[PDB]
A paper describes a structure:
A crystal structure of the lutein-binding domain of human StARD3 (StAR-related lipid-transfer protein 3; also known as MLN64) has been refined to 1.74 Å resolution. The final structural model includes residues 231–444 of StARD3 (the coordinates for residues 216–230 were omitted because no electron density was observed), 224 water molecules, three molecules of ethylene glycol, one sulfate ion and one molecule of l-(+)-tartaric acid. A striking feature of StARD3LBD is the prominent tunnel-like cavity lined by hydrophobic and polar residues with sufficient volume to accommodate a molecule of cholesterol, as demonstrated by modeling. The cavity communicates with bulk solvent through two openings, which we will call portal 1 and portal 2. Portal 1 is wider in diameter compared with portal 2 (4  × 8 Å for portal 1 versus 2 × 4 Å for portal 2; distances are measured between solvent-accessible surfaces). A segment of four residues (Gly336, Ala337, Ala338 and Gly339) was associated with weaker-than-average electron density along two alternative chain paths, suggesting that the Ω1 loop is capable of movement just outside portal 1. The new structure includes additional solvent molecules and alternate conformations for several residues, including Arg351, which is located within the cavity, and residues Gly336–Gly339, which are part of the omega loop found just outside the cavity entrance. Structural flexibility in these regions may be necessary for the binding of bulky ligands such as lutein.
StARD3 has since been recognized as a carotenoid-binding protein in the primate retina, where its biochemical function of binding lutein with specificity appears to be well suited to recruit this photoprotective molecule. The lutein-binding function of StARD3 resides within the C-terminal START domain comprising residues 216–444, hereafter referred to as StARD3LBD. The most remarkable structural feature characteristic of StARD3 and StARD1 is a large (∼1000 Å3) solvent-filled cavity.
Numbering used by the authors: 231 to 444
The structure:
């Protein structure tokens, strides 16, 4: 591996370690907001990157289906997930480290403009869960441009937890630490992120339903 490939690999492992640490501290998550579907958003304060949002949703399908639809098919997720405007895999390192270009849709109400991102992700399959953990990185094919504000994710990820007791249900967790930059006050950004998390959950639920109807 080149030095650059090794740095991408390390970044994915580091992001995975933080995701694991957050999941191991669930008793310390602070409730923030929920909705009428029981989607629940929490926060946790993490060193350096600070405040991190966590979405937890119970879904009526096997964990493997969510792993396929969210974690293994990020480009296809653009089609059904309106919070995702675009996704392009720029580069793969080994089988489980990927560098992507990602564009997030403007806030449902237009106050927060779309951001684009460059991310490294590490995908791990475990006995009882699937993880896609990642963090901002740089890639020469996608410099910042005037088309978008270039946001920067801290450590976070998508996690699907298998149910030991009922194979027909699973738990979906989105850990989201991000800096959208710009000059809006933080509280407005935080409102927009929570809203985006609920919208994500809505599209994921609809996708699982559509797949279960066929």
């Amino acid at each position: 591996f080149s030095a650059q490939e090794r740095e991408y690999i390390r970044q994915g492992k580091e992001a995975t370690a933080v995701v694991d640490q957050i999941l191991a501290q669930e008793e310390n998550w602070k409730f923030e907001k929920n909705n009428e579907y029981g989607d629940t958003v929490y926060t946790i304060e993490v060193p350096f990157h600070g405040k991190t949002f966590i979405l937890k949703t119970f879904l009526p399908c096997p964990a493997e289906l969510v792993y396929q639809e969210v974690i293994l098919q990020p480009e296809r997720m653009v089609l059904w997930n309106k919070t995702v405007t675009a996704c392009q895999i720029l580069q793969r390192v080994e089988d489980n480290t990927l560098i992507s270009y990602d564009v997030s849709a403007g806030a449902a109400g237009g106050v927060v403009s779309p951001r684009d991102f460059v991310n490294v992700r590490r995908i791990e399959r475990r006995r009882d869960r699937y993880l896609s953990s990642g963090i901002a990185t740089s890639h020469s094919a996608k410099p910042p441009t005037h088309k978008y504000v270039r946001g920067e994710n801290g450590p976070g990820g998508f996690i699907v937890l298998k149910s030991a007791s009922n194979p027909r249900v699973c738990t979906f967790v989105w850990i989201l630490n991000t800096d959208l930059k710009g000059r809006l006050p933080r509280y407005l950004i935080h409102q927009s992120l929570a809203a985006t998390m609920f919208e994500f959950a809505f599209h994921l639920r609809q996708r699982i339903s559509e797949l279960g109807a066929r």
